[PDB]
Design a protein around this motif. Structure first.
Motif, PDB file in Angstrom:
ATOM      1  N   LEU A   6      17.206   6.823   4.623  1.00 59.20           N
ATOM      2  CA  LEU A   6      18.627   6.704   4.317  1.00 59.20           C
ATOM      3  C   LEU A   6      19.051   5.240   4.254  1.00 59.20           C
ATOM      4  O   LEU A   6      19.759   4.828   3.337  1.00 59.20           O
ATOM      5  N   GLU A   7      18.609   4.459   5.236  1.00 57.72           N
ATOM      6  CA  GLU A   7      18.941   3.040   5.291  1.00 57.72           C
ATOM      7  C   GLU A   7      18.436   2.316   4.046  1.00 57.72           C
ATOM      8  O   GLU A   7      19.102   1.424   3.521  1.00 57.72           O
ATOM      9  N   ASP A   8      17.253   2.704   3.582  1.00 62.08           N
ATOM     10  CA  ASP A   8      16.658   2.091   2.400  1.00 62.08           C
ATOM     11  C   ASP A   8      17.545   2.296   1.177  1.00 62.08           C
ATOM     12  O   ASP A   8      17.845   1.348   0.448  1.00 62.08           O
ATOM     13  N   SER A  12       0.781   8.363  -6.002  1.00 63.15           N
ATOM     14  CA  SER A  12       1.961   7.705  -6.550  1.00 63.15           C
ATOM     15  C   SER A  12       3.079   8.713  -6.799  1.00 63.15           C
ATOM     16  O   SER A  12       3.114   9.373  -7.836  1.00 63.15           O
ATOM     17  N   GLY A  13       3.992   8.825  -5.839  1.00 68.45           N
ATOM     18  CA  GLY A  13       5.099   9.753  -5.973  1.00 68.45           C
ATOM     19  C   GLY A  13       6.365   9.245  -5.312  1.00 68.45           C
ATOM     20  O   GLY A  13       6.586   9.475  -4.123  1.00 68.45           O
ATOM     21  N   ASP A  14       7.196   8.553  -6.082  1.00 70.23           N
ATOM     22  CA  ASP A  14       8.446   8.010  -5.564  1.00 70.23           C
ATOM     23  C   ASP A  14       9.605   8.965  -5.831  1.00 70.23           C
ATOM     24  O   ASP A  14       9.429  10.012  -6.456  1.00 70.23           O
ATOM     25  N   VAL A  15      10.790   8.598  -5.353  1.00 63.15           N
ATOM     26  CA  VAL A  15      11.978   9.423  -5.540  1.00 63.15           C
ATOM     27  C   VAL A  15      13.038   8.684  -6.350  1.00 63.15           C
ATOM     28  O   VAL A  15      13.708   7.785  -5.841  1.00 63.15           O
ATOM     29  N   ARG A  16      13.183   9.068  -7.614  1.00 62.32           N
ATOM     30  CA  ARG A  16      14.161   8.442  -8.495  1.00 62.32           C
ATOM     31  C   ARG A  16      15.583   8.776  -8.054  1.00 62.32           C
ATOM     32  O   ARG A  16      16.015   9.927  -8.136  1.00 62.32           O
ATOM     33  N   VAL A  17      16.306   7.764  -7.587  1.00 61.33           N
ATOM     34  CA  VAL A  17      17.679   7.950  -7.134  1.00 61.33           C
ATOM     35  C   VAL A  17      18.667   7.278  -8.081  1.00 61.33           C
ATOM     36  O   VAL A  17      18.742   6.050  -8.149  1.00 61.33           O
ATOM     37  N   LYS A  18      19.423   8.089  -8.813  1.00 61.25           N
ATOM     38  CA  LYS A  18      20.407   7.575  -9.756  1.00 61.25           C
ATOM     39  C   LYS A  18      21.739   7.309  -9.062  1.00 61.25           C
ATOM     40  O   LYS A  18      22.295   8.189  -8.406  1.00 61.25           O
ATOM     41  N   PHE A  19      22.246   6.089  -9.212  1.00 61.33           N
ATOM     42  CA  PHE A  19      23.513   5.708  -8.599  1.00 61.33           C
ATOM     43  C   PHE A  19      24.652   5.785  -9.612  1.00 61.33           C
ATOM     44  O   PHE A  19      24.425   5.750 -10.821  1.00 61.33           O
ATOM     45  N   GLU A  20      25.878   5.893  -9.108  1.00 59.89           N
ATOM     46  CA  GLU A  20      27.052   5.977  -9.969  1.00 59.89           C
ATOM     47  C   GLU A  20      28.249   5.283  -9.324  1.00 59.89           C
ATOM     48  O   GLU A  20      28.681   5.652  -8.232  1.00 59.89           O
ATOM     49  N   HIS A  21      28.782   4.276 -10.010  1.00 60.18           N
ATOM     50  CA  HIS A  21      29.930   3.530  -9.506  1.00 60.18           C
ATOM     51  C   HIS A  21      30.920   3.235 -10.627  1.00 60.18           C
ATOM     52  O   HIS A  21      30.642   2.431 -11.518  1.00 60.18           O
ATOM     53  N   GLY A  52       0.806  -1.207   0.000  1.00 60.32           N
ATOM     54  CA  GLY A  52       0.000   0.000   0.000  1.00 60.32           C
ATOM     55  C   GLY A  52       0.842   1.260   0.000  1.00 60.32           C
ATOM     56  O   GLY A  52       1.791   1.381   0.775  1.00 60.32           O
ATOM     57  N   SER A  53       0.496   2.202  -0.873  1.00 61.57           N
ATOM     58  CA  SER A  53       1.232   3.456  -0.974  1.00 61.57           C
ATOM     59  C   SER A  53       0.531   4.562  -0.189  1.00 61.57           C
ATOM     60  O   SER A  53      -0.605   4.928  -0.492  1.00 61.57           O
ATOM     61  N   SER A  54       1.217   5.089   0.819  1.00 65.70           N
ATOM     62  CA  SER A  54       0.660   6.149   1.651  1.00 65.70           C
ATOM     63  C   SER A  54       0.619   7.471   0.890  1.00 65.70           C
ATOM     64  O   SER A  54       1.530   8.291   0.997  1.00 65.70           O
ATOM     65  N   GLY A  55      -0.447   7.671   0.120  1.00 65.73           N
ATOM     66  CA  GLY A  55      -0.589   8.893  -0.648  1.00 65.73           C
ATOM     67  C   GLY A  55      -0.526   8.649  -2.143  1.00 65.73           C
ATOM     68  O   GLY A  55      -0.465   7.504  -2.590  1.00 65.73           O
ATOM     69  N   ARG A  96      22.924   3.006 -11.615  1.00 66.81           N
ATOM     70  CA  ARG A  96      21.816   2.200 -11.117  1.00 66.81           C
ATOM     71  C   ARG A  96      20.697   3.088 -10.578  1.00 66.81           C
ATOM     72  O   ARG A  96      20.888   3.824  -9.610  1.00 66.81           O
ATOM     73  N   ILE A  97      19.532   3.014 -11.213  1.00 62.34           N
ATOM     74  CA  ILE A  97      18.385   3.810 -10.796  1.00 62.34           C
ATOM     75  C   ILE A  97      17.511   3.042  -9.810  1.00 62.34           C
ATOM     76  O   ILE A  97      17.312   1.834  -9.950  1.00 62.34           O
ATOM     77  N   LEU A  98      16.991   3.749  -8.813  1.00 55.93           N
ATOM     78  CA  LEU A  98      16.136   3.134  -7.803  1.00 55.93           C
ATOM     79  C   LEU A  98      14.879   3.967  -7.573  1.00 55.93           C
ATOM     80  O   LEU A  98      14.775   5.096  -8.053  1.00 55.93           O
ATOM     81  N   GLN A  99      13.929   3.404  -6.834  1.00 54.16           N
ATOM     82  CA  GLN A  99      12.681   4.097  -6.539  1.00 54.16           C
ATOM     83  C   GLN A  99      12.303   3.936  -5.070  1.00 54.16           C
ATOM     84  O   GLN A  99      12.086   2.823  -4.592  1.00 54.16           O
ATOM     85  N   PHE A 100      12.227   5.057  -4.358  1.00 50.07           N
ATOM     86  CA  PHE A 100      11.877   5.040  -2.943  1.00 50.07           C
ATOM     87  C   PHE A 100      10.706   5.977  -2.662  1.00 50.07           C
ATOM     88  O   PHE A 100      10.822   7.201  -2.749  1.00 50.07           O
ATOM     89  N   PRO A 101       9.550   5.392  -2.314  1.00 53.17           N
ATOM     90  CA  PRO A 101       8.336   6.155  -2.013  1.00 53.17           C
ATOM     91  C   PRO A 101       8.448   6.931  -0.705  1.00 53.17           C
ATOM     92  O   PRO A 101       8.510   6.341   0.374  1.00 53.17           O
ATOM     93  N   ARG A 102       8.473   8.256  -0.808  1.00 49.19           N
ATOM     94  CA  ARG A 102       8.579   9.111   0.367  1.00 49.19           C
ATOM     95  C   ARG A 102       7.561   8.706   1.428  1.00 49.19           C
ATOM     96  O   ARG A 102       6.471   8.219   1.125  1.00 49.19           O
ATOM     97  N   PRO A 103       7.922   8.909   2.704  1.00 52.45           N
ATOM     98  CA  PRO A 103       9.216   9.488   3.078  1.00 52.45           C
ATOM     99  C   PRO A 103      10.378   8.540   2.798  1.00 52.45           C
ATOM    100  O   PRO A 103      10.319   7.356   3.131  1.00 52.45           O
TER     101      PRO A 103
END
Length: 103
Positions: free
Chosen positions: A30-32, A6-15, A1-4, A20-27
Protein backbone atom coordinates in the motif's frame (compact mmCIF):
# COMPACT_ATOMS: atom_id res chain seq x y z
CA UNK A 1 16.00 -9.25 -8.30
CA UNK A 2 12.42 -10.36 -8.92
CA UNK A 3 11.08 -12.89 -6.43
CA UNK A 4 9.38 -15.23 -8.88
CA UNK A 5 8.20 -15.05 -12.49
CA UNK A 6 7.86 -11.64 -14.13
CA UNK A 7 4.43 -10.64 -12.86
CA UNK A 8 3.78 -7.05 -11.79
CA UNK A 9 0.52 -5.27 -10.99
CA UNK A 10 -0.50 -2.54 -13.43
CA UNK A 11 -2.08 0.24 -11.37
CA UNK A 12 -3.86 2.95 -13.36
CA UNK A 13 -4.15 6.31 -11.60
CA UNK A 14 -6.74 9.04 -12.19
CA UNK A 15 -6.54 12.70 -11.17
CA UNK A 16 -8.94 15.33 -12.53
CA UNK A 17 -8.92 13.61 -15.91
CA UNK A 18 -5.19 12.95 -15.70
CA UNK A 19 -3.92 9.36 -15.70
CA UNK A 20 -0.77 7.62 -14.49
CA UNK A 21 0.15 3.95 -14.87
CA UNK A 22 2.50 2.21 -12.44
CA UNK A 23 4.06 -1.21 -11.92
CA UNK A 24 4.36 -2.97 -8.56
CA UNK A 25 5.81 -6.51 -8.38
CA UNK A 26 3.73 -8.55 -5.94
CA UNK A 27 3.44 -8.72 -3.15
CA UNK A 28 2.12 -5.19 -3.65
CA UNK A 29 2.56 -2.70 -0.80
CA UNK A 30 0.00 0.00 0.00
CA UNK A 31 2.79 2.41 0.95
CA UNK A 32 4.50 1.71 -2.38
CA UNK A 33 1.41 2.62 -4.41
CA UNK A 34 1.06 5.93 -2.56
CA UNK A 35 4.77 6.75 -2.52
CA UNK A 36 5.02 6.49 -6.30
CA UNK A 37 1.78 8.33 -7.04
CA UNK A 38 3.19 11.03 -4.76
CA UNK A 39 6.46 11.20 -6.69
CA UNK A 40 4.79 11.11 -10.10
CA UNK A 41 2.51 14.06 -9.31
CA UNK A 42 4.57 15.52 -6.47
CA UNK A 43 1.64 15.98 -4.11
CA UNK A 44 -0.03 14.04 -1.29
CA UNK A 45 -3.13 12.31 -2.66
CA UNK A 46 -5.30 9.42 -1.46
CA UNK A 47 -5.79 6.19 -3.41
CA UNK A 48 -9.41 5.30 -4.17
CA UNK A 49 -9.93 2.15 -6.23
CA UNK A 50 -13.34 1.04 -7.52
CA UNK A 51 -14.08 -2.68 -7.48
CA UNK A 52 -17.22 -2.69 -9.64
CA UNK A 53 -19.59 0.22 -9.02
CA UNK A 54 -18.61 1.34 -5.51
CA UNK A 55 -15.44 3.06 -4.32
CA UNK A 56 -13.01 1.65 -1.75
CA UNK A 57 -10.51 4.16 -0.30
CA UNK A 58 -7.28 2.20 0.12
CA UNK A 59 -6.35 3.24 3.65
CA UNK A 60 -5.07 0.00 5.17
CA UNK A 61 -3.22 -3.01 3.75
CA UNK A 62 -6.35 -5.12 4.14
CA UNK A 63 -7.85 -2.98 1.37
CA UNK A 64 -4.85 -3.33 -0.94
CA UNK A 65 -4.37 -7.06 -0.35
CA UNK A 66 -8.08 -7.46 -1.10
CA UNK A 67 -7.77 -5.27 -4.20
CA UNK A 68 -4.74 -7.15 -5.53
CA UNK A 69 -6.19 -10.59 -4.80
CA UNK A 70 -9.59 -9.75 -6.28
CA UNK A 71 -7.94 -8.26 -9.36
CA UNK A 72 -6.01 -11.38 -10.33
CA UNK A 73 -9.00 -13.68 -9.85
CA UNK A 74 -11.21 -11.17 -11.65
CA UNK A 75 -11.16 -11.89 -15.38
CA UNK A 76 -13.23 -8.98 -16.71
CA UNK A 77 -11.11 -6.49 -14.77
CA UNK A 78 -7.84 -5.76 -16.57
CA UNK A 79 -6.11 -3.61 -13.95
CA UNK A 80 -6.70 -2.02 -10.54
CA UNK A 81 -8.55 1.21 -11.30
CA UNK A 82 -7.33 3.91 -8.91
CA UNK A 83 -8.58 7.44 -8.24
CA UNK A 84 -6.13 10.00 -6.85
CA UNK A 85 -7.77 12.65 -4.68
CA UNK A 86 -6.01 15.67 -3.20
CA UNK A 87 -5.54 15.55 0.57
CA UNK A 88 -3.18 18.24 1.84
CA UNK A 89 -0.63 16.87 4.30
CA UNK A 90 0.36 13.64 6.04
CA UNK A 91 -0.59 12.74 9.61
CA UNK A 92 1.57 9.76 10.60
CA UNK A 93 4.35 10.05 8.01
CA UNK A 94 6.37 8.17 10.63
CA UNK A 95 5.54 4.52 10.00
CA UNK A 96 4.98 2.48 13.16
CA UNK A 97 4.36 -1.18 14.10
CA UNK A 98 1.26 -2.62 15.75
CA UNK A 99 0.28 -5.65 17.82
CA UNK A 100 -3.45 -6.11 17.13
CA UNK A 101 -4.26 -9.24 19.14
CA UNK A 102 -6.20 -10.00 22.33
CA UNK A 103 -3.92 -12.23 24.39
Amino acid sequence: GSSGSSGDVRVKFEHRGEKRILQFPRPVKLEDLRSKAKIAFGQSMDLHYTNNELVIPLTTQDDLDKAVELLDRSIHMKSLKILLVINGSTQATNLEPSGPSSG
